[PDB]
């Protein structure tokens, strides 16, 4: 359902530094969350589980690329640090919360690099 549009376009010139931040739905239990780069396959960047903690996708030092933070009304922020953006970092980024009782909630960012 997300491969129709849904997401937000994000333009950048090479060299740019950009933070993407995603936010949990109110009044849900946070079950797990993750960041992915979406091509033909969904390639996970980092995953956070509220008990097991951080887990990275393939060789990463991803603890320097993501951060989770709680705020006021149980809402959680989930952010991805993009640094020194090349055309290779361009593409579709997907933040996927799995919540209870509402299930999956996803936010798509299209990073466009000139």
């Amino acid at each position: 359902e997300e491969l129709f549009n849904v997401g937000d376009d994000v333009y950048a010139l090479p060299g740019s530094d950009i933070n993407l931040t995603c936010q949990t739905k109110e009044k849900n239990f946070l079950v797990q969350m993750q960041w992915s780069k979406v091509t033909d396959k969904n390639d996970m960047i980092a995953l956070y589980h509220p008990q097991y903690g951080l887990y990275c996708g393939q060789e990463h030092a991803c603890e320097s690329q993501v951060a989770a933070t709680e705020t006021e009304k149980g809402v959680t922020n989930w952010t991805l640090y993009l640094r020194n953006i090349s055309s290779a970092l361009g593409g579709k980024y997907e933040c996927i919360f799995t919540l209870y009782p509402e299930g999956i909630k996803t936010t798509v960012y299209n990073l466009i690099v000139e």
Partner: antibody
Amino acid sequence: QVQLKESGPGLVQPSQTLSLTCTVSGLSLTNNIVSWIRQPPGKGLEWMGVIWSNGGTDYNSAIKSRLSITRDTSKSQVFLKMNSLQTEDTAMYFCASRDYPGFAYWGQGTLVTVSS
Amino acid sequence: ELIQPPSSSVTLGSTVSLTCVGDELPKRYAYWYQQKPDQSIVRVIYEDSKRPSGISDRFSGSSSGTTATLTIRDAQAEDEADYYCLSTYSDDKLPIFGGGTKLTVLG
């Protein structure tokens, strides 16, 4: 770069309690776990216990009765406290973290000698 | 619980496979650690067969049923170490280490 550094007294007397501290840098302690692993001299690694990303804990059932793990998120430190020590507790003590259960980062370890 | 042979040999340039056998390994991933004499610990294989950045491509891994194996190719002297496998046990999914295999490189 992340670094885990264990610190401790080096020498503790039998029937005293052993207080170790793991200082985490480059990892957000509130988003990560920290395990304590021990290695008696010449022996293999034995997992001792974990404080989960949410402040809960679990321990190896063979030492659970004397073991206690806590944390101070603001100081970014995790504490191991183990009471009523015998000579067999003489070991190298490591903390490790992230990619549970396949801990990706390890401290160097501190040696603890239990002796009168 | 996690069964590893306490020692093994290879001669320079040849291949060893080190094994780790456990009941739940068909349902749990295995991780492999190399511990050098100064006692520092390095993760060389994760999730049965994935290799982390910065580890020599002579290291690889594979799993079938209840034995996970770690495979060192073109053995170098600096592969002399203790290798430990790590996995998860019981309903509470807690970690366990095998007993460790001491690997000596001959020649």
